[PDB]
Design an enzyme around this catalytic site. Structure first.
Site, PDB file in Angstrom:
ATOM      1  N   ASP C  46      43.497  34.040  51.960  1.00 28.52           N
ATOM      2  CA  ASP C  46      43.949  33.994  50.575  1.00 28.52           C
ATOM      3  C   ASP C  46      45.399  33.526  50.533  1.00 28.52           C
ATOM      4  O   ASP C  46      46.265  34.103  51.197  1.00 28.52           O
ATOM      5  CB  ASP C  46      43.789  35.368  49.926  1.00 28.52           C
ATOM      6  CG  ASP C  46      44.306  35.414  48.497  1.00 28.52           C
ATOM      7  OD1 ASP C  46      45.521  35.232  48.277  1.00 28.52           O
ATOM      8  OD2 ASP C  46      43.484  35.634  47.585  1.00 28.52           O
ATOM      9  N   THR C  80      46.413  28.396  47.154  1.00 25.85           N
ATOM     10  CA  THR C  80      46.362  27.438  48.252  1.00 25.85           C
ATOM     11  C   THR C  80      46.464  26.001  47.747  1.00 25.85           C
ATOM     12  O   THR C  80      47.223  25.189  48.298  1.00 25.85           O
ATOM     13  CB  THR C  80      45.067  27.620  49.046  1.00 25.85           C
ATOM     14  OG1 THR C  80      43.945  27.372  48.191  1.00 25.85           O
ATOM     15  CG2 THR C  80      44.966  29.026  49.596  1.00 25.85           C
ATOM     16  N   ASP C 377      40.750  38.018  42.598  1.00 26.97           N
ATOM     17  CA  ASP C 377      40.531  36.600  42.327  1.00 26.97           C
ATOM     18  C   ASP C 377      39.362  36.389  41.372  1.00 26.97           C
ATOM     19  O   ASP C 377      39.428  35.535  40.481  1.00 26.97           O
ATOM     20  CB  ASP C 377      40.302  35.846  43.637  1.00 26.97           C
ATOM     21  CG  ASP C 377      41.484  35.945  44.578  1.00 26.97           C
ATOM     22  OD1 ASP C 377      42.634  35.949  44.093  1.00 26.97           O
ATOM     23  OD2 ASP C 377      41.263  36.024  45.805  1.00 26.97           O
TER      24      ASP C 377
END
Lengths: 511, 95, 506, 188, 509, 95, 107
Positions: C46, C80, C377
């Site tokens: 993550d 990311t 998330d």
């Protein structure tokens, strides 16, 4: 490891050569001083005169020299555009191998890009038909007014058109032979007297008693012995007197007439003189006897003239006396020595039968440099007109082909699939260095100029290019600068061929 | 059974490396191509081959790309004997 | 070092952090190892944590992590993608500046390409929205969270709990709803399937009051904090009685304080009662004889959170035992604390939506923290999907669709920004580039294959495979990401480039 | 000694292997103006200066029986080099060389038997012979750049060799080195 | 160092170095600089005044230049970059001449006469439209702010932004540091709508139940200015009591909170009727304040307190002390409006309306930050312009007007001063050059045509950052005040002449 | 098919290393012994293994040597997942 | 060993995630084959007694002890047969006492 490293080194050497040559591009140009072993200077705006005398160590440099030589022998101009395309493609290759994609895919993708680029350049160009004198003169003036040889190319362009018309009917698309149309000098003179010489101009003769001109000249091709051979020494015995060498002296005096009677039954009018290493001897004491009954000797013939005269007047090559039969004889209309506008002993052959209509242009001038600049002007004029006639449809220059080709090649890479797609995209977006080089050598911001050209080619006119004689991007002026479409075709095809060969090259090995 | 089983597997891998080099020189994914070829003609399907013209598995029976038997047998035997000659020498001396 | 060379070194450092983060993209992201100041280790792909936990001794890297943090809650999965896209943009800007383009020009070109990419993202829309019937579409969207991480059984229950919590916590659903209050709780223990949605708060209870009614239909709750048994403000208390009958007098006083007050409290409609500290079980026996279900050991923050859940505020003394002061619940139910070995009573407060939380269990501390990040998330993506119902196909498909759009648009302008937008195009291309780099397939082959598929066939739902389903169309794959989520990712990437592209720091 | 030379020669031949390979450039010593580019690994092996005695004996053991059959060189050299590298790994793993020799002898026997089993006969039928000869010519004429000229070589060589029908005329076949016209067409 | 030229050229180099800390931050779109504090704190600011304030300068020449820059910051604030660049470029263009060996007193009086002439030319060529009363001039200031804001390129809401900011600054706001009249930015929502806050208030309140039923629209709330708070776990009593009954333990739990209950009761009964606290407050405390029929705001920023000082007319309480309404501030408007997701509580309308701040909501982050700088600059320029007698065309134009005039006067004045005035005029070109370079690096290409068309005829033409082309900097409503430009040019000239007047630096360690 | 073939073949040989390590610690001709056992299983002997008391292959049912299923299965699965979690990390970040 | 071969494969330019996928497939197949190939001693008494004896003896032989493995294993299986299937780690009471010899151990 090793293959990637050696390919990187080869690319680096090729790019070093290309970027050292990059500044000297196009009519504007900027020179360098050559790094040589004598320390002299060069003010040569062109690019070819660096590679042709470049101290080359790496084989990449040698292969780029062969690239430039091949481009010059093919079409002449563009000898720097080809090498700069090569360097830009190798830089794109450096990027691609930095990402690690394989060289063979690079070669195949560049071949595809070449094919599509040739299609694109053939498409957008103006399909000018080259069949009659008005079209030929239009092409000639468009080709000459864009260079710095315009001042004197004007008087010689119609005559070059006449020569190329002699060679073939322009309805025949086969290329004319550059070597067939030979260029010759008659020493000194004015400028306007440079005139077409149908047939050939020949070397100077010796005029003891030979005739200066002859109608229906029976030209013979002679390469054989002249005398009883003075084989090894001037005297064979005690040197008190030439008691026995008198025999070979009078045998000279007899064999000269023997060969002249062997000639007259055929009728050889002239005599091309091969050098004394092939001939037994050559001297006035026999050349006078040959001259007085109609065998005129012409000095120091060379192999190119021998081949040219064989091709023109049908005289077969000769190495001995026994083949004096009509195969070695030609029957022209008239042969004259002409000395107008300054004396000159160069012989001329006129109206002889010929399978190929070989034609030559004599060059005159008050200075030797003027004569040679006229020769190189007529040379490049024949180059451009021949590469036009063999391919038609000339193209506007000044980086416009590069911009239009990069744009449509980028969209082709867009529609193309596979690994080759990004390779073609990189090929297109790196090939644009030529207009960038013109912008750099024109003083404009190169990147902004390239963007402006690409934007104007989009959604609008595709012939817009960078103007070198007025300044900046222009579209309204169609005659910015024009080159035969073969110039760009040869540039792209030879550049891509050499780049994909470089990609194919691995692990250089000393013998 | 013998310890030469490892040498036999090494021979198999070295011979397998030849089409790997064929793929690598052609720019295709060598490992993927050779592994999928191993699967393609290890599950029977003896005629399956690697089609280098597009970099995909190719049923070689109908494509027609074939190599004469004599040259393959000769190259196999010559490589074997040359590898034996080079391998079986352990130390060298010179004049 | 000043000027363009200093900015070159700065781009080098940004690339150093970016390529380090590059391998962690997507559901198939390759993990990263973090060793901290405390000396502990953890494996995690993550992005949010491996930026936050990561430290780099360069100021621009600090601005990288700070700017990613500033949109942490706003963009969960993108942690990311935004960083890797900024890194690719800087890598292309390296070449662009090597060609001499001034940094603000390429910054504004990136901004223009951002506008073009956003307007192109507007062209792809799905996920019809209706709250009751959205359950199936929303669990199909949460399939992205399910199939990616270690949840091999891909529990539909966690997707359902997330979607129901988010859809219930705000009755109004049109736009910009107040999903800030919700949070997820978890602890090591039973299976990951041990989850339960509460329209209220779960308390922590000791295992006294064993068989007492942990489930009561208490509309109102006694929030009486007075010590039924001697208090403990970190300070213990003492007992002293003259005789056993004196202690029986103490018992009858205790009986007054229990029966009388709790009769009053039941008259006000509450049976469950809190105590601030417990003392001993023999005092609890009187409460058992009174059939009292009660809990205690609530901390300061714990009891304050109970107060905000139940709307009532603490009652420390006798004189404040009125109905109005005590907190409401509406209902209370009991659910196993772990899998089965322990039990917990849970207080819902359904009459007010101001307190909805999610409880999850896990078999390991690594498992529970992975569940924490995964459910956070999923909560973020469902929140951002229901805030703006428009959605775009993920799996790199949206990024390369924008790449086609902005690259084809790059020919629309004459200024220097053309190379800037082309750099934006082949930088948006990194998402499938690196998403195949961290996956198995060759990066460029698959990236260009799907890129050309988007040209041979016009549907922009084509992306690289990330779960080896054997298909390059993402519509059946359903690896989908919120449209406004993608907009935030691209916009944050452009701003994140701009904020260090115009920097000539000391 | 260790087989660095035997794998070095193989590595320098590897990239030339087969069609769509990689080219090599060979240049004379002394920095004189002479070089040539070549794809056929046999040309490199002919022009290589073998400073390693192991590489020298390897290329010599190839030359006695590799250029005879034709095109085997790029395969035999690379296969032998890969075998030597794998055997170097084996001897690093303490596998004695004679064990490897015996294992490779038996393995080559097995491989040759499998090749014979997989080999397909194509005699007694003229059309199968025609297609096989064009295919083998195309695979052996896999060197020229021009694909139509590739087909020209294929057809010319096939029709030149098939018209025998009998015992070999390779002793009598020749390919005249005289220069002609277009570089893309062939003749017999 | 050594006397005369060798030390003066070192001063030249030092001034160039201190310029490099500002050289690229001139334009509004110029490069921003990250400057790191010794504490390990990273701060970002693209304005030269803040950069030089954070930057420590050690070299005496840089020390003098930064001192002049700080004096100009106290004068205007944005002129710091301009004066530093002018001083540095004056020194750069006298560097070849001073290195040649001419005495610096020559360039001292040369700059003196050149800048006196430049001030005369500024006062002659400056023009006034002022006359701000009519609606046409209100929207003229509107379009000026619009041109300052043109980075947004929004539709008519661009003019709405401009109208709101010009109205907020024109309502009874004198020339000041402008810090109290700041702005805030909010996620979500439409950029077409936002709140014209009539004062300043708290960013975003909490999720407490007292918020939803909070008493909106106080008619005239007296305010309490607190910093000490009441919250959980903060304080307790370590009392020990033997058992006597069951009614006795509540003495301990009483002692835990009774002083706090009395404190809150009295501080709310002080005379105030809404209370603010800089530190967090408990929800239970909020409920007892609701029992006081009252509301509290915790965690308020200190800038709220300062804006309360200068606008609300209040005074700090800071604890339970001052149980009197005398020292308490007043408000005329209070409410809470959740601006999109921003749970903003409002208490506005003050004895002094010096702050009438705005809060932005446009659903982004990258735009509204440069928007904060753009509105800052526009609201600053309008207020400095209205005070001054006259305004002149800025943005690289008037620098060229002065450069052309001083070149013409230099080329006609005799004596060695004319080379020096020409060097001064060429150095005055730096601001257009840096505006162009920081914008598109095309400085020469646009500068050439700019100077040519400026010399073609009398015009105020200069560089436009919006299109990298020449635009009518006057009548495009991008301006610099004439008096401020006099101050900037004169301060730069004094700095340059002072720093080039010095030969030796003296040390006595 | 696919690149996974080489990966799982290498995993199989890594499994083969475990009895190779056992034999090496025993001092036997470990490579030859594991080659013999591999051949025994390839020809087909699901009960063939190594006699640890004296180095040789043997049908392990008669010898009575064995191990419990649960421990072996858990060792395989746990070692596989541990190697997986180690491999799934490329670089370590330290502070 | 797996990590050694993994680094060897990474040197061979095989990507880590392909290694993970192939390894997981290989473990699936290996576990399936192991389960399908393991032998259940099943429903028997005397043969099951001998099987319990020797499996316990060999499992305990994995430790350092070589002499009195059999006695401990027989005692353990006696306890487990008293369990009759109800596995109980706490059915055995485990007392420790320093001194003496390993042969002095008693159940």
């Amino acid at each position: 490891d090793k293959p990637a490293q050696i390919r990187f080194s080869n690319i680096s050497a090729a790019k070093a050569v290309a970027d050292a040559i990059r500044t000297s591009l196009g009519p504007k140009g900027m020179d360098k001083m050559i790094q040589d072993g004598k320390g002299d200077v060069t003010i040569t705006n062109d690019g070819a005169t660096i590679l042709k005398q470049m101290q080359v160590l790496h084989p990449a440099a040698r292969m780029l020299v062969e690239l430039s030589k091949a481009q010059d022998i093919e079409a002449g101009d563009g000898t720097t555009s080809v090498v700069i395309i090569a360097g830009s493609l190798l830089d794109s290759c450096t990027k691609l191998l930095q990402k690690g994609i394989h060289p063979t895919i690079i070669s195949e993708s560049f071949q595809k890009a070449l094919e599509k680029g040739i299609e694109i350049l053939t498409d957008m160009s103006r399909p000018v038909e080259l069949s009659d004198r008005e079209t030929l003169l239009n092409s000639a003036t468009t080709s000459l007014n864009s260079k710095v040889v315009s001042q004197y190319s004007s008087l010689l362009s119609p005559m070059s058109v006449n020569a190329v018309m002699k060679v073939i009917d322009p309805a025949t698309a086969t290329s004319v032979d550059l070597r067939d149309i030979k260029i010759v000098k008659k020493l000194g003179g004015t400028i306007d007297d440079c005139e077409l010489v149908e047939g050939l101009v020949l070397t100077q003769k010796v005029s003891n008693s030979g005739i200066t001109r002859v109608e229906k000249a029976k030209i013979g091709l002679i390469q054989f012995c002249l005398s009883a051979p003075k084989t090894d020494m001037d005297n064979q015995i005690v040197v008190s007197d030439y008691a026995q060498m008198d025999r070979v002296l009078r045998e000279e005096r007899a064999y000269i007439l023997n060969l002249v009677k062997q000639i007259k039954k055929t009728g050889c009018n002239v005599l091309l003189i091969q050098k004394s290493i092939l001939r037994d001897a050559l001297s006035d004491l026999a050349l006078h006897f040959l001259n007085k009954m109609k065998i005129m000797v012409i000095k120091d013939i060379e192999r190119e003239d021998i081949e040219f005269i064989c091709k023109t007047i049908g005289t077969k090559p000769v190495a001995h006396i026994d083949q004096f039969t009509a195969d070695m004889l030609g029957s022209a209309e008239l042969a004259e020595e002409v000395n107008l506008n300054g004396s000159g002993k160069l012989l001329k052959i006129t109206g002889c039968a010929s399978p190929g209509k070989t034609v030559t242009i004599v060059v005159r001038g008050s200075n030797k440099l003027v004569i040679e600049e006229a020769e190189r002007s007529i040379h490049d004029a024949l180059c451009v007109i021949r590469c036009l006639v063999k391919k038609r449809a000339l193209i506007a220059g000044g980086g416009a082909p590069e911009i239009e080709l990069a744009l449509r090649l980028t969209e082709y890479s867009r529609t193309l699939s596979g690994m080759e797609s990004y390779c073609v995209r990189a090929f297109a977006d790196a090939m644009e260095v030529i207009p960038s080089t013109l912008a750099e050598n024109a003083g404009l911001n190169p990147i902004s100029t390239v963007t402006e050209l690409r934007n104007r080619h989009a959604q609008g006119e595709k012939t817009a290019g960078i103007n070198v004689r007025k300044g900046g991007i222009s579209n309204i002026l169609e005659e910015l600068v024009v080159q035969p479409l073969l110039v760009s075709v040869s540039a792209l095809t030879l550049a891509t061929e050499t780049v994909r060969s470089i990609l194919k090259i691995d692990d250089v090995v000393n013998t | 059974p013998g310890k030469e089983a490892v040498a036999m597997e090494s021979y198999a891998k070295a011979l397998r490396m030849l089409p790997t080099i064929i793929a690598d020189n052609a720019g295709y994914d060598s490992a993927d191509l050779v592994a999928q070829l191993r699967a393609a003609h290890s599950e029977g399907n003896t005629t399956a081959g690697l089609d280098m013209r597009e970099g995909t598995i190719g049923d070689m029976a109908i494509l027609g790309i074939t190599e004469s038997f004599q040259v393959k047998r000769q190259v196999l035997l010559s490589a074997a004997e040359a590898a034996e000659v080079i391998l079986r020498v352990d130390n060298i001396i010179k004049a | 070092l000043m000027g363009l060379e200093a900015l070159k070194s700065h781009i080098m450092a940004a690339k150093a952090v970016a390529n380090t983060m590059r391998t962690s993209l997507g559901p198939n992201g390759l993990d990263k190892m973090m060793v901290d100041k405390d000396g502990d280790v953890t494996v995690t792909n993550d992005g949010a944590t491996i930026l936050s936990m990561m430290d780099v001794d360069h100021q621009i890297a600090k601005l990288m992590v700070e700017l990613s943090k500033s949109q942490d809650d706003e963009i969960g999965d993108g942690t990311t993608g935004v960083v890797v896209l900024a890194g690719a943009l800087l890598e292309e800007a390296e070449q662009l500046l090597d060609r001499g383009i001034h940094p603000i020009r390429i910054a504004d070109g990136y901004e223009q390409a951002a506008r073009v990419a956003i307007e192109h993202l507007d062209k792809i829309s799905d996920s019809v929205l209706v709250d009751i019937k959205d359950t199936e579409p929303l669990i199909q969207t949460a399939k992205t969270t399910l199939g990616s991480k270690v949840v091999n059984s891909c529990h539909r229950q966690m997707a359902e709990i997330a979607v129901n919590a988010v859809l219930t916590v705000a009755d109004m659903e049109r736009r910009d709803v107040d999903f800030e209050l919700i949070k997820v709780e978890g602890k090591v223990g039973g299976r990951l399937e041990d989850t339960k949605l509460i329209k209220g708060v779960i308390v922590d209870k000791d295992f006294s009051h064993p068989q007492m009614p942990k489930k009561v239909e208490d509309a109102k709750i006694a929030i009486l904090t007075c010590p039924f048994e001697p208090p403990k403000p970190k300070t213990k208390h003492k007992l002293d009685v003259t005789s056993v009958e004196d202690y029986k007098a103490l018992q009858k006083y205790e009986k007054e304080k229990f029966e009388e007050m709790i009769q009053q409290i039941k008259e006000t409609g509450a049976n469950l009662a809190i105590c601030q500290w417990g003392f001993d079980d023999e005092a609890n026996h009187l409460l058992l004889q009174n059939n009292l279900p009660a809990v205690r050991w609530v901390g300061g923050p714990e009891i304050e959170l109970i107060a905000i859940a139940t709307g009532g505020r603490i009652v420390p003394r006798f004189s404040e035992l009125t109905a109005e002061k005590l907190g409401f619940a509406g209902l209370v139910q009991e659910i196993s604390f772990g899998t089965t070995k322990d039990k917990m009573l849970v207080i819902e407060q359904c009459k007010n939506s101001r307190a909805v939380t999610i409880f999850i269990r896990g078999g390991n501390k690594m498992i529970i923290e992975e569940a924490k990040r995964s459910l956070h998330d999923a909560l973020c993506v469902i929140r951002n999907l229901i805030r703006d119902n428009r959605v775009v196909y993920g799996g790199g498909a949206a990024e390369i669709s924008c790449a086609l759009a902005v690259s084809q648009e790059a020919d629309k302008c004459p200024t220097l920004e053309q190379y800037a937008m082309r750099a934006f195009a082949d930088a948006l291309e990194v998402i499938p580039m690196a998403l195949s780099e961290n996956s198995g397939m060759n990066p460029i082959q698959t990236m260009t294959e799907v890129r050309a598929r988007q040209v041979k066939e016009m549907n922009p739902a084509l992306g690289i495979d990330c779960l080896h389903k054997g298909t390059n169309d993402m519509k059946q794959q359903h690896v989908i990401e919120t449209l406004i989520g993608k907009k935030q990712q691209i916009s944050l990437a452009t701003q994140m480039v701009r904020m260090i592209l115009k920097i000539d720091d000391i | 000694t260790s087989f660095i030379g035997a794998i070095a020669i193989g590595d320098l031949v590897k990239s030339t292997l087969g069609p769509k390979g990689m080219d090599k450039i060979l240049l004379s010593s002394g920095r004189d103006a002479s070089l040539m580019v070549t794809n056929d690994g046999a040309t490199i092996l002919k022009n290589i200066g073998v400073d390693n005695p192991a590489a020298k004996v390897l290329v010599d053991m190839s030359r006695v029986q590799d250029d005879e059959v034709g095109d085997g060189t790029t395969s035999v050299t690379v296969l032998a080099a890969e075998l030597l590298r794998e055997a170097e790994s084996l001897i690093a793993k303490k596998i004695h060389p004679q064990t490897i020799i015996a294992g490779w002898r038996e393995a080559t026997k097995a491989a040759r038997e499998a090749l014979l089993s997989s080999a397909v006969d194509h005699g007694s039928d003229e059309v199968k012979f025609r297609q096989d000869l064009m295919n083998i010519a195309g695979t052996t004429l896999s060197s020229k750049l021009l694909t139509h000229h590739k087909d020209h070589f294929t057809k010319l060589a096939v029709e030149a060799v098939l018209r025998l029908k009998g015992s070999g005329n390779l002793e009598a076949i020749h390919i005249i080195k005289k220069l002609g016209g277009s570089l893309a067409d062939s003749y017999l | 160092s050594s006397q005369g030229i060798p030390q003066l050229v070192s001063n030249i180099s030092a001034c160039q170095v201190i310029a490099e800390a500002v050289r690229t931050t001139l334009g509004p779109r110029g490069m921003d600089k990250l400057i790191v504090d010794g504490r390990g704190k990273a701060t970002i600011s693209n304005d030269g005044a803040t950069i030089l304030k954070l930057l420590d300068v050690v070299h005496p020449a840089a020390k003098t230049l930064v001192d002049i820059a700080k004096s100009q910051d106290a004068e205007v604030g944005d002129g710091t970059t301009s004066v530093t660049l002018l001083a540095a470029e004056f020194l750069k263009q006298v560097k070849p001449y001073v290195e040649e060996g001419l005495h610096p007193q020559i360039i001292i009086r040369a700059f003196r006469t050149a800048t006196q002439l430049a001030v005369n030319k500024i006062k002659e060529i400056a023009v006034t439209v002022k006359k701000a009363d009519k609606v046409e001039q209100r929207k003229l200031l509107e379009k000026c702010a619009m041109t300052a804001l043109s980075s947004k390129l929004i539709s008519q809401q661009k003019a709405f932004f401009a109208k709101m900011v010009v109205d907020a600054v024109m309502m009874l706001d004198d020339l000041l540091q402008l810090k109290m009249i700041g702005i805030k930015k909010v996620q979500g929502g439409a950029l077409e709508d936002s709140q014209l806050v009539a004062g300043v208030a708290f960013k975003k309140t909490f999720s407490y139940a007292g918020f939803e039923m909070q008493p909106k629209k106080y008619h005239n709330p007296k305010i309490a200015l607190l910093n000490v708070e009441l919250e959980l776990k903060a304080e307790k009593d370590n009392a020990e009591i033997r058992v006597h009954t069951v009614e006795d333990y509540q003495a301990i739990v009483d002692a835990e909170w009774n002083i706090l209950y009395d404190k809150l009761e009295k501080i709310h009964h002080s005379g105030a009727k809404v209370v603010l606290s800089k530190l967090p407050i408990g929800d239970v405390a909020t409920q007892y304040f609701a029992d006081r029929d009252m509301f509290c705001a915790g965690r308020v920023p200190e800038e709220d307190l300062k804006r309360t000082m200068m606008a609300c007319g209040g005074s700090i309480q800071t604890s339970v002390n001052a149980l009197s309404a005398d020292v308490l501030g007043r408000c005329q408007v209070f409410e809470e409006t959740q601006i999109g997701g921003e749970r903003y509580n409002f208490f506005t309308g003050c004895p002094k309306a010096k702050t009438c701040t705005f809060i932005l909501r446009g659903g982004a982050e990258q735009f509204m930050e440069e928007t904060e700088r753009s509105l800052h600059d526009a609201i600053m320029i309008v207020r400095r312009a209205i005070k001054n007698d006259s305004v002149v065309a800025g943005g690289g134009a008037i620098e060229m007007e002065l450069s052309k005039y001083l070149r013409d006067y230099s080329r006609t004045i005799p004596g060695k001063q004319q080379l020096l005035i020409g060097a001064y005029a060429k150095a005055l070109e730096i601001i257009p050059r840096q505006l162009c370079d920081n914008a598109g690096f095309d400085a020469t290409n646009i500068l050439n045509k700019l100077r040519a068309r400026h010399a073609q005829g009398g015009t105020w033409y200069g560089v436009d950052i919006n299109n990298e082309d020449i635009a009518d900097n006057f009548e495009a409503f991008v301006w610099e005040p004439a008096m401020v430009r006099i101050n900037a040019l004169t301060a730069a000239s004094e700095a340059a002449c002072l720093i080039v007047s010095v030969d030796e630096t003296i040390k006595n360690p």
